Write a structure and sequence with these properties.
The PDB classes it as hydrolase/inhibitor. This protein has about 350 residues and is α/β, with parallel strands linked by helices. It is about 35% helix and about 10% strand. It has one domain. Helix 8 packs parallel to helix 9 and helix 8 runs parallel beside helix 11. The structure holds 3,5-difluoro-N-hydroxybenzamide, potassium ion (2 copies) and zinc ion.
Length: about 350
């Protein structure tokens, strides 16, 4: 009954050479690791080594054009780095960026392999840069390659091609890249909760609305839970899990659960504006461990208050290790009930549990 953990200090080398205070900080991952030490969680986990993703692995989800462009940045002078980064939506690049993106992905491949070979029951991946905004053909939103999407395809590649993978994306932003990569796929169920605000919140696309349910064979296998009207917290997230995430996931019966675990919906985040607590994230984790015989891999995405993300991710690891869920502390905001009922109207056609 083992929990795995992957962390590698080399992923701190990716950095913003114009703005040392850009919130996607190198210390995001060292702070989370340090808090695991302080809580004596690290010695309770089995350390999984990081590795580089290969180019063939990246091609499970990304075009050769995109792979080639990001790879070429490793050798670019600052002028071309600043210029290349400015061509994407919200990207900075250093000469170390490509390597760190490869390590983030390969770390998650090794973690998924450890779970699927029975070496650990579940795992946490403390990685950066994030992945869920990255598309097949372009970088976006601090993300170069789509780590979670690649990990789902990697998992299928070492088991069977149709392995049922659930990706629950609780980062406060919509994972536009993960949705698009699997939009026509019934083997990977994508469920995202995200601040939407009728399309005004990053990444600023109505692709994130509840009526986008999937295409072709994938009809019904894309579940967007969009929040509108300000602050959301534990009551809203627990309601969404009760009414939507868990009934759907149980019917899908995944063989592996990946969490796109951004912690920017957390109380204190400078960018999310929400107030999910560390106890709230622990309860979401504990609920997902009831799926896939416990085979859950928690993958860091966003989250920018260093104290908040360190406390929140550590509580998730405590749940994976089998600790009892903490106590929670309110009626739902009206608009949250509106959002949940809209998703039920969108997905009741596809799920007999709805
Ligand atoms: O990746 C992100 N959050 O987890 C992110 C990406 C952006 F382009 C902007 C932002 F404020 C946040
Ligand atoms: K999300
Ligand atoms: K899908
Ligand atoms: Zn985010």
């Amino acid at each position: 009954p083992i929990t795995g953990l992957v962390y590698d200090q080399r992923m701190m080398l990716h950095h913003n050479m114009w703005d040392s205070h850009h919130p996607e900080l190198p210390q995001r991952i060292s702070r989370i690791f340090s808090r695991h030490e302080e809580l004596r969680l690290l010695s309770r986990c089995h350390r999984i080594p990081a590795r580089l993703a290969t180019e063939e692995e990246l091609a499970l989800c990304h075009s050769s054009k995109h792979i080639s462009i990001i790879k070429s940045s490793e050798h670019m002078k600052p002028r071309d780095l600043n210029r290349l980064g400015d061509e994407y939506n919200s990207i900075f690049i250093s000469n170390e960026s490509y390597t760190c993106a490869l390590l983030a992905a390969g770390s998650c491949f090794n973690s998924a392999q450890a779970i699927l070979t029975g070496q650990v029951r579940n795992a946490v991946a403390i990685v950066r840069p994030p992945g869920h905004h990255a598309e097949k053909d372009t970088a976006c939103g601090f993300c170069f390659f789509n780590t979670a999407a690649l990990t789902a395809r990697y998992a299928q590649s070492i088991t069977r091609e149709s392995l049922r993978v659930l990706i629950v994306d609780w980062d406060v932003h919509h994972g536009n890249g993960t949705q698009h990569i699997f939009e026509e796929d019934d083997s990977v169920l994508y469920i995202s909760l995200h601040r939407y605000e009728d399309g005004a919140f990053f990444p600023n696309s109505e692709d994130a609305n509840y009526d986008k349910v999937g295409l072709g064979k994938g009809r019904g296998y894309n579940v967007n839970i969009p929040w509108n009207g300000g602050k959301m917290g534990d009551p809203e997230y627990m309601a969404a899990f009760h009414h939507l995430v868990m009934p759907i996931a149980r019917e899908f019966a995944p063989e592996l659960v990946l969490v796109s675990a951004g912690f920017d919906a957390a109380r204190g985040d400078p960018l999310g504006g929400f107030q999910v607590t560390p106890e709230g994230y622990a309860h979401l984790t504990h609920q997902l461990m009831s799926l896939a015989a416990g085979r859950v891999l928690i993958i860091l995405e966003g989250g920018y208050n260093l104290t908040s993300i360190s406390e929140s991710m550590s509580m998730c690891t405590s749940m994976l290790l089998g600790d009892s869920p903490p106590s929670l502390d309110t009626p739902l905001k009206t608009s949250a009930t509106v959002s949940i009922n809209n998703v039920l109207r969108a997905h009741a056609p596809f799920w007999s549990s709805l």
